[PDB]
Coordinates of C-alpha atoms and ligand atoms in Angstrom, one line a residue:
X2 CA 6.9 220.7 47.5
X3 CA 8.9 220.9 44.3
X4 CA 8.3 218.4 41.5
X5 CA 11.2 216.4 40.4
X6 CA 11.4 216.1 36.6
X7 CA 12.0 212.7 34.7
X8 CA 15.4 211.8 33.8
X9 CA 16.3 212.5 30.3
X10 CA 19.5 210.4 30.2
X11 CA 20.1 206.8 28.8
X12 CA 20.9 204.1 31.3
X13 CA 24.6 204.1 30.5
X14 CA 24.9 207.9 31.0
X15 CA 22.8 207.6 34.2
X16 CA 25.2 205.1 35.7
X17 CA 28.4 207.3 34.5
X18 CA 26.9 210.4 36.2
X19 CA 26.1 208.3 39.4
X20 CA 29.6 206.8 39.4
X21 CA 31.7 210.1 38.9
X22 CA 29.6 212.1 41.6
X23 CA 29.4 209.1 44.0
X24 CA 30.0 210.3 47.6
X25 CA 31.2 206.6 48.4
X26 CA 33.6 206.7 45.4
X27 CA 35.0 210.0 46.6
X28 CA 35.3 208.8 50.3
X29 CA 37.0 205.5 49.0
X30 CA 39.6 207.5 47.0
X31 CA 40.4 209.3 50.2
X32 CA 40.7 206.2 52.1
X33 CA 43.1 204.8 49.5
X34 CA 45.2 208.2 49.9
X35 CA 45.4 207.4 53.6
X36 CA 43.1 210.5 54.5
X37 CA 40.9 210.6 57.7
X38 CA 37.4 211.1 56.1
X39 CA 35.9 211.5 59.7
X40 CA 38.3 214.4 60.5
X41 CA 37.9 215.9 56.9
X42 CA 34.6 215.0 55.3
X43 CA 33.5 215.9 51.7
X44 CA 31.2 218.7 53.0
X45 CA 34.1 220.3 54.9
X46 CA 36.7 220.1 52.3
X47 CA 38.1 223.6 51.3
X48 CA 40.2 225.4 48.9
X49 CA 41.9 227.3 51.7
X50 CA 42.8 223.9 53.6
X51 CA 44.1 222.4 50.2
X52 CA 46.1 225.8 49.7
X53 CA 47.4 225.5 53.3
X54 CA 48.6 221.8 52.7
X55 CA 50.3 222.9 49.4
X56 CA 52.1 225.8 51.3
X57 CA 53.3 223.1 53.9
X58 CA 54.6 220.9 51.0
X59 CA 56.4 224.1 49.5
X60 CA 58.0 224.5 53.0
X61 CA 58.9 220.8 53.0
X62 CA 60.3 221.2 49.4
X63 CA 62.7 224.0 50.5
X64 CA 63.8 221.9 53.8
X65 CA 64.9 219.2 51.4
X66 CA 66.8 221.3 49.0
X73 CA 62.7 224.1 61.0
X74 CA 63.2 220.2 60.8
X75 CA 61.6 217.8 58.4
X76 CA 59.5 216.5 61.5
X77 CA 58.3 219.9 62.6
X78 CA 57.3 220.8 59.0
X79 CA 55.7 217.2 58.5
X80 CA 53.7 217.5 61.7
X81 CA 52.3 220.8 60.3
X82 CA 51.2 219.3 57.0
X83 CA 49.6 216.3 58.9
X84 CA 47.7 218.8 61.0
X85 CA 46.4 220.7 58.0
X86 CA 45.6 217.5 55.9
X87 CA 44.5 214.8 58.4
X88 CA 45.8 211.2 57.8
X89 CA 44.8 207.8 59.2
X90 CA 47.5 205.4 60.0
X91 CA 46.3 202.8 62.5
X92 CA 46.8 205.3 65.4
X93 CA 50.5 205.4 64.9
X94 CA 53.3 208.1 64.3
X95 CA 52.7 209.6 60.7
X96 CA 55.8 209.2 58.5
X97 CA 57.8 212.3 57.9
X98 CA 58.2 213.5 54.3
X99 CA 61.9 213.3 53.8
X100 CA 62.2 212.2 50.3
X101 CA 61.3 213.9 47.0
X102 CA 59.2 210.7 46.1
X103 CA 57.0 211.1 49.3
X104 CA 56.9 214.8 48.6
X105 CA 55.5 214.3 45.1
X106 CA 53.2 211.6 46.4
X107 CA 51.6 214.1 48.8
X108 CA 51.3 216.7 45.9
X109 CA 49.6 214.2 43.8
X110 CA 47.3 213.3 46.7
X111 CA 46.4 217.1 47.0
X112 CA 45.9 217.5 43.2
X113 CA 43.3 214.6 43.5
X114 CA 41.7 216.1 46.7
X115 CA 41.4 219.5 44.9
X116 CA 39.6 217.8 42.0
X117 CA 37.2 216.2 44.5
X118 CA 36.5 219.5 46.3
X119 CA 35.9 220.9 42.6
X120 CA 33.2 218.2 42.0
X121 CA 31.9 219.2 45.6
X122 CA 31.8 222.9 45.1
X123 CA 30.0 222.1 41.6
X124 CA 27.1 220.3 43.4
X125 CA 26.4 223.2 45.7
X126 CA 22.6 224.3 45.5
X127 CA 22.7 227.9 44.4
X128 CA 19.6 230.3 45.5
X129 CA 18.7 230.7 41.6
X130 CA 18.0 226.9 41.9
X131 CA 16.1 227.2 45.2
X132 CA 13.9 229.9 43.6
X133 CA 12.4 227.5 40.9
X134 CA 9.2 225.4 41.5
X135 CA 10.3 222.5 39.5
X136 CA 13.8 220.8 39.9
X137 CA 15.7 218.5 37.4
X138 CA 16.2 214.8 38.1
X139 CA 19.3 214.6 40.4
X140 CA 21.3 212.9 37.7
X141 CA 20.2 215.7 35.1
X142 CA 21.2 218.4 37.4
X143 CA 24.8 216.7 37.9
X144 CA 25.1 216.3 34.1
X145 CA 24.1 219.9 33.5
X146 CA 26.8 221.2 36.2
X147 CA 29.4 219.7 34.1
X148 CA 28.6 222.1 30.9
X149 CA 29.7 219.2 28.9
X150 CA 28.0 217.4 26.2
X151 CA 28.2 213.7 26.4
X152 CA 26.9 211.6 23.7
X153 CA 26.7 207.9 23.9
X154 CA 28.4 206.3 20.8
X155 CA 26.6 203.7 18.8
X156 CA 28.3 200.2 18.3
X157 CA 27.8 200.8 14.5
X158 CA 29.4 204.4 14.3
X159 CA 32.8 204.0 12.3
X160 CA 34.8 205.8 15.3
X161 CA 33.4 203.1 17.7
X162 CA 35.1 200.3 15.7
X163 CA 38.3 202.6 15.3
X164 CA 38.3 203.1 19.1
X165 CA 37.6 199.5 19.9
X166 CA 40.5 198.3 17.7
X167 CA 42.9 201.1 19.5
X168 CA 41.8 199.6 22.9
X169 CA 42.1 195.8 21.8
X170 CA 45.3 196.2 19.9
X171 CA 47.2 198.3 22.6
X172 CA 45.5 197.0 25.8
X173 CA 47.3 194.5 28.3
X174 CA 47.9 191.1 26.4
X175 CA 46.2 188.9 28.9
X176 CA 44.2 191.1 31.2
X177 CA 42.5 193.1 28.5
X178 CA 40.0 195.8 29.7
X179 CA 36.4 195.0 28.4
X180 CA 34.8 197.9 26.6
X181 CA 31.4 198.9 27.9
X182 CA 30.4 202.3 26.5
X183 CA 32.2 205.0 24.6
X184 CA 30.8 208.6 24.9
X185 CA 31.7 211.5 22.6
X186 CA 32.9 214.3 24.7
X187 CA 32.2 218.0 23.6
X188 CA 33.7 220.3 26.5
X189 CA 31.8 223.6 25.6
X190 CA 34.7 226.0 26.1
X191 CA 37.5 223.8 24.7
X192 CA 36.4 224.3 21.0
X193 CA 37.5 228.0 20.9
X194 CA 40.8 227.4 22.9
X195 CA 41.8 224.6 20.5
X196 CA 41.2 227.0 17.5
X197 CA 44.5 228.8 18.6
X198 CA 46.2 225.7 17.4
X199 CA 44.3 225.1 14.2
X200 CA 47.4 225.7 12.0
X201 CA 49.4 223.1 14.2
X202 CA 49.5 219.7 12.4
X203 CA 50.5 216.2 13.6
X204 CA 47.1 215.5 15.4
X205 CA 46.8 212.1 17.1
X206 CA 44.1 210.5 19.4
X207 CA 46.0 209.6 22.6
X208 CA 45.0 207.8 26.0
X209 CA 44.6 209.6 29.3
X210 CA 43.8 207.2 32.2
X211 CA 42.9 208.6 35.4
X212 CA 41.2 208.2 39.1
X213 CA 37.5 207.9 39.0
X214 CA 37.4 210.9 41.6
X215 CA 38.9 213.2 39.0
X216 CA 36.5 212.5 35.9
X217 CA 34.0 215.1 37.1
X218 CA 36.5 217.8 37.3
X219 CA 38.1 216.9 33.9
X220 CA 34.6 216.9 32.2
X221 CA 34.0 220.4 33.7
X222 CA 37.6 221.9 33.1
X223 CA 39.5 219.8 30.7
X224 CA 43.0 218.4 31.3
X225 CA 45.3 220.8 33.1
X226 CA 48.8 221.8 34.0
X227 CA 48.6 222.6 37.9
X228 CA 51.5 224.4 39.3
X229 CA 52.5 221.4 41.7
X230 CA 52.0 218.6 38.9
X231 CA 55.1 216.9 37.5
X232 CA 56.4 213.5 36.4
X233 CA 59.3 211.7 34.6
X234 CA 59.0 214.3 31.6
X235 CA 58.3 217.4 33.6
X236 CA 55.3 219.8 34.0
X237 CA 52.9 219.0 31.2
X238 CA 49.7 216.7 30.2
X239 CA 50.7 213.2 30.0
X240 CA 49.3 211.0 27.2
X241 CA 50.1 207.3 25.9
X242 CA 49.8 205.7 22.4
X243 CA 49.4 202.4 24.4
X244 CA 46.2 201.7 26.4
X245 CA 48.0 199.4 28.8
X246 CA 50.3 202.3 29.7
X247 CA 47.4 204.6 30.6
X248 CA 45.3 201.7 32.2
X249 CA 48.1 201.7 34.9
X250 CA 46.9 205.1 36.1
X251 CA 43.2 204.0 36.0
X252 CA 41.9 203.7 39.7
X253 CA 38.6 202.0 39.3
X254 CA 36.1 200.9 42.0
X255 CA 34.4 197.6 42.9
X256 CA 30.9 197.4 41.6
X257 CA 29.2 194.1 42.1
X258 CA 31.4 191.4 40.6
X259 CA 33.1 193.8 38.2
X260 CA 35.8 196.5 38.5
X261 CA 34.5 199.7 36.5
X262 CA 37.0 202.5 35.4
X263 CA 37.1 205.4 33.0
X264 CA 39.7 206.3 30.3
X265 CA 39.8 209.4 28.0
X266 CA 40.8 209.8 24.5
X267 CA 42.3 213.2 23.7
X268 CA 43.0 214.8 20.3
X269 CA 46.4 216.2 20.8
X270 CA 48.1 218.8 18.4
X271 CA 51.6 217.5 18.6
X272 CA 53.1 219.7 15.9
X273 CA 56.9 219.2 15.7
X274 CA 58.1 216.5 18.1
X275 CA 61.3 216.5 20.3
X276 CA 62.2 212.9 21.2
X277 CA 64.1 211.7 24.4
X278 CA 65.2 208.5 25.7
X279 CA 66.0 209.6 29.5
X280 CA 63.8 211.0 32.2
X281 CA 63.8 214.8 32.5
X282 CA 61.6 215.8 35.4
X283 CA 62.7 219.5 35.1
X284 CA 61.1 220.2 31.7
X285 CA 58.4 222.9 31.6
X286 CA 58.4 223.3 27.9
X287 CA 59.6 221.5 24.5
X288 CA 63.1 222.9 23.4
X289 CA 62.6 226.0 21.0
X290 CA 60.9 225.2 17.6
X291 CA 59.2 222.2 19.0
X292 CA 55.5 221.7 20.1
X293 CA 55.6 218.5 22.2
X294 CA 58.1 216.1 23.9
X295 CA 57.8 212.3 23.5
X296 CA 59.7 210.0 26.0
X297 CA 60.1 207.3 23.5
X298 CA 59.2 203.5 24.7
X299 CA 60.7 200.3 23.8
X300 CA 57.5 199.7 21.7
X301 CA 55.1 201.6 19.7
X302 CA 51.9 200.8 18.1
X303 CA 52.9 199.7 14.6
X304 CA 52.7 202.9 12.4
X305 CA 51.9 200.8 9.3
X306 CA 48.5 200.3 10.9
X307 CA 47.6 203.8 11.8
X308 CA 44.1 204.9 10.4
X309 CA 42.7 208.5 10.6
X310 CA 39.5 210.1 11.9
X311 CA 38.0 213.3 10.7
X312 CA 37.1 215.6 13.5
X313 CA 35.9 219.1 13.0
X314 CA 37.4 219.3 9.6
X315 CA 40.8 218.1 10.7
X316 CA 42.5 214.7 10.0
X317 CA 43.5 212.8 13.5
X318 CA 45.9 209.9 13.5
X319 CA 44.5 206.9 15.5
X320 CA 46.9 204.0 16.1
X321 CA 45.4 200.5 15.1
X322 CA 48.4 198.5 15.3
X323 CA 49.9 196.1 18.3
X324 CA 53.1 197.6 20.0
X325 CA 56.1 196.5 17.9
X326 CA 59.8 197.1 18.8
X327 CA 61.4 200.7 18.4
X328 CA 65.1 199.4 17.9
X329 CA 66.5 203.0 18.0
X330 CA 65.0 203.4 21.6
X331 CA 65.7 199.7 22.7
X332 CA 67.9 201.7 25.0
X333 CA 65.6 204.0 26.6
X334 CA 64.6 204.5 30.3
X335 CA 60.9 204.3 29.1
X336 CA 59.2 200.8 28.5
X337 CA 56.3 202.5 27.0
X338 CA 55.9 206.1 25.3
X339 CA 54.8 209.3 27.2
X340 CA 53.4 212.0 24.9
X341 CA 53.8 215.6 26.5
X342 CA 52.3 219.1 25.8
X343 CA 53.0 222.1 27.9
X344 CA 50.0 224.0 27.0
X345 CA 46.4 223.2 27.8
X346 CA 45.1 224.4 24.6
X347 CA 47.0 221.7 22.6
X348 CA 44.5 219.0 23.9
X349 CA 40.8 218.5 23.1
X350 CA 38.8 215.9 24.8
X351 CA 37.1 213.7 22.3
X352 CA 35.9 210.4 24.0
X353 CA 35.2 208.8 27.3
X354 CA 35.3 205.1 27.7
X355 CA 33.8 202.9 30.4
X356 CA 35.9 199.8 30.9
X357 CA 35.5 196.7 33.3
Ligands
M95_401 O1 46.3 211.1 37.5 C1 47.4 210.9 37.3 C2 48.2 210.5 36.1 C3 47.5 210.2 34.8 C4 48.2 209.7 33.8 N1 47.5 209.0 32.7 C5 47.9 208.6 31.6 O2 47.3 208.2 30.9 C6 49.5 208.6 31.5 C7 50.1 208.2 30.4 C8 51.5 208.3 30.3 C9 52.2 208.8 31.3 C10 51.6 209.3 32.3 C11 50.2 209.3 32.6 N2 49.7 209.7 33.7 N3 48.3 211.1 38.3 C12 47.8 211.6 39.7 C13 48.2 212.8 40.2 O3 47.3 213.9 39.8 C14 48.4 210.5 40.8 C15 48.4 209.1 40.4 C16 47.3 208.4 39.8 C17 47.5 207.0 39.4 C18 48.6 206.3 39.7 C19 49.8 207.0 40.1 C20 49.7 208.4 40.6

């Protein structure tokens, strides 16, 4: 019988690791995406099955631009769904097609967290095992350091959250962790000369936090949105909090949000949706879909991160009269290369 070593993590990090690897949180997420967890359990999830589902969706994509019913029936056989034992709806719109692609991008991140927890033979040939939470923490290959309430960047982040959060239903700050993805430091070096660095929000499903802490923010071949195939960020917390899918934990609703250091370089501004973009125009390093409002730039502050100055908005959203006429209520900041982002903070919000 193998000795289990004591946990080295603080209570807040223990809770975080428990939540982002929680089998119930993963099964809940699959129930919320209408998947059949009985016909497709977490242990049975495979990369081949997810690849097969994307192939069916790529085939359905062509048929929109074999009937839609035949091709939909094949997708629903590969990726089992639960719909009160009724006929599954045919994927006959670019909206329902992107929804199923978003569902599969989440499920691929669930599979990743599942593949990551696989007990290897090198782990089986050791007489002392780490505490389960230490083991899951170590599989991330990502240093997480709980921030102190007295650290200067804690107050800068808290102000950013409070000033740009939803006016009434303001998310309550619980914890801030410094994120040091060991692998992201060397890739971000290939953008050291690129200026205009800003700390921006990235809100997400609890089910994809583990995959992001292991692999960073990525541009997958089937991802998209109103500003094309890139990594999406916001200068307003309330905008990113909309993509935060949390979970019921007692009386509270716990969720996680990221702060990323984004090297924006030369910005290209737009005021109309362009879902076909895959890069900025020549000479530009980022695209900004300009909102009706923007955190007051007069109140911007800076943080020094690895010798570089990073702009941190501190002001409340104020009108952008040039972009009063914009299809975007709130701004969306886009980069089209993964190396232009560096994960810096992880926030727990209730
Ligand atoms: O995880 C995300 C989106 C995160 C996201 N997070 C943001 O912080 C954000 C800010 C500005 C504009 C878009 C933004 N999108 N999307 C998933 C596909 O992988 C699907 C999804 C998740 C939540 C709500 C709607 C769709």
